[PDB]
Design a protein around this motif. Structure first.
Motif, mmCIF file in Angstrom:
data_model
loop_
_atom_site.group_PDB
_atom_site.id
_atom_site.type_symbol
_atom_site.label_atom_id
_atom_site.label_comp_id
_atom_site.label_asym_id
_atom_site.label_seq_id
_atom_site.Cartn_x
_atom_site.Cartn_y
_atom_site.Cartn_z
ATOM 1 N N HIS A 277 0.806 -1.263 0.000
ATOM 2 C CA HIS A 277 0.000 0.000 0.000
ATOM 3 C C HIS A 277 0.828 1.299 0.000
ATOM 4 O O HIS A 277 0.278 2.372 -0.057
ATOM 5 C CB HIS A 277 -0.946 0.002 1.184
ATOM 6 C CG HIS A 277 -0.298 0.307 2.472
ATOM 7 N ND1 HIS A 277 0.247 -0.521 3.293
ATOM 8 C CD2 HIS A 277 -0.147 1.538 3.048
ATOM 9 C CE1 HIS A 277 0.709 0.124 4.311
ATOM 10 N NE2 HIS A 277 0.478 1.395 4.186
ATOM 11 N N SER B 129 5.088 2.817 7.810
ATOM 12 C CA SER B 129 4.568 1.758 6.921
ATOM 13 C C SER B 129 5.662 1.191 6.042
ATOM 14 O O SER B 129 6.525 1.933 5.642
ATOM 15 C CB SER B 129 3.452 2.389 6.096
ATOM 16 O OG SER B 129 2.868 3.281 7.058
ATOM 17 N N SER C 56 2.033 -2.696 8.406
ATOM 18 C CA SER C 56 0.902 -2.621 7.468
ATOM 19 C C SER C 56 -0.201 -1.637 7.815
ATOM 20 O O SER C 56 -0.422 -0.712 7.056
ATOM 21 C CB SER C 56 0.379 -4.046 7.386
ATOM 22 O OG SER C 56 -0.647 -4.122 6.411
HETATM 23 ZN ZN LIG Z 1 0.740 2.931 6.013
#
Ligand SMILES: [Zn+2]
Ligand SMILES: N=C(N)c1ccc2[nH]c(Cc3nc4ccccc4[nH]3)nc2c1
Ligand code: NA
Lengths: 11, 252, 36
Positions: free
Chosen positions: B43, B198, B219
């Protein structure tokens, strides 16, 4: 806030 | 990282910074697993709800850092990407299941006292260390509070939590490719990863051979260090065959 | 790169390789129902 990084890493 | 402290020089030689070329900003964290491959969270690169779809050409990888905003001349190495590989079944539509991506660097980086890869766990190491109560370490240059950016890399050691407690802390559907960590409201200890962290590593140190293994990838979470909530991480061992496959199918 | 890493993976130049510990690794090994 980031310091400039050498031009050769952008090209 | 919330309620974490500054790292020591050379404490996480595998920590990588994904840096955007224009604007020049920190995107995510990542880890170095060989001299040509970096592992991060998918992501960080692809998240269509926010129109995020980065390409090779849009990123830079910075290895060997400590300071967040300074170009640490003669210490850090900046590399370009050759290819980005996102897990084919990364689920951005629902719960970020299989949030992992591999990046191939244009050229091999040279190790130093500040650049060294981490080990990827094998079935047995995963089996003995991923137990509830055992602590892991997360590092990053992310936010310091939910709503506050550090000048140096931060670290916090968190305990792995029992899956039922993880599941009962959220409405999102948890899969086997994720695990959660953090202290219970009850334990009077805090800490968590947060925005900017992240993609980075959750690592554990094997008491059997003294090596550090990367068990998870930062995550997601709901807020940063909220009581009754936890941080979720991709289960690296569970997605390791995918890793092996792209590596020996496309390089090393 | 793959299983169990790379070869010299996980051994930090400034710590394991010189037998120096960082200030909080004790916390970790102690939670694996104590290490060593
Ligand atoms: Zn993130
Ligand atoms: N509390 C946590 N353990 C937590 C970890 C990671 C994370 N990530 C996000 C959303 C998020 N991910 C990104 C990626 C890139 C730019 C912005 C951004 N915001 N929330 C969290 C929360
Ligand atoms: Na919490």
């Amino acid at each position: 806030d980031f310091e400039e990084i050498p031009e050769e890493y952008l090209q | 990282i919330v309620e974490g402290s500054d790292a020591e020089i050379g404490m996480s030689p595998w920590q990588v910074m994904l840096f955007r070329k224009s604007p020049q900003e920190l995107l995510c964290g990542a880890s170095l697993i060989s001299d040509r491959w970096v592992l991060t969270a998918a992501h960080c690169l692809l998240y269509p709800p926010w129109d995020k779809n980065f390409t090779e050409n849009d990123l830079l990888v910075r290895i060997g850092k400590h300071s967040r905003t300074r170009y640490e001349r003669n210490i850090e190495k900046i590399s370009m990407l050759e290819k980005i590989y996102i897990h084919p079944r990364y689920n951005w539509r629902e719960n970020l299941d299989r949030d992992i991506a591999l990046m191939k660097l244009k050229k091999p980086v040279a190790f130093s006292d500040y650049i060294h890869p981490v080990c990827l766990p094998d079935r047995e190491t995963a089996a003995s260390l991923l137990q509830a109560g055992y602590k892991g370490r997360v590092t990053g240059w992310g936010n310091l509070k939910e709503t506050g950016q550090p000048s140096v890399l931060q670290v916090v050691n968190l305990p792995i939590v029992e899956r039922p407690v993880c599941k009962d802390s959220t409405r999102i559907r948890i899969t086997d490719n994720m695990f959660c960590a953090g202290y219970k409201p009850d334990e009077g200890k805090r800490g968590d990863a947060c925005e900017g962290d992240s993609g980075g590593p959750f690592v554990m140190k094997s008491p059997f051979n003294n090596r550090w293994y990367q068990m998870g990838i930062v995550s997601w979470g709901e807020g940063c260090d909220r009581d009754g909530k936890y941080g979720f991480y991709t289960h690296v061992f569970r997605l390791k065959k995918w890793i092996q496959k792209v590596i020996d199918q496309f390089g090393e | 790169t793959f299983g169990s890493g790379e070869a010299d993976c996980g051994l930090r130049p400034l710590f394991e390789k010189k037998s120096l510990e960082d200030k909080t690794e004790r916390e970790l090994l102690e939670s694996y129902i104590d290490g060593r």
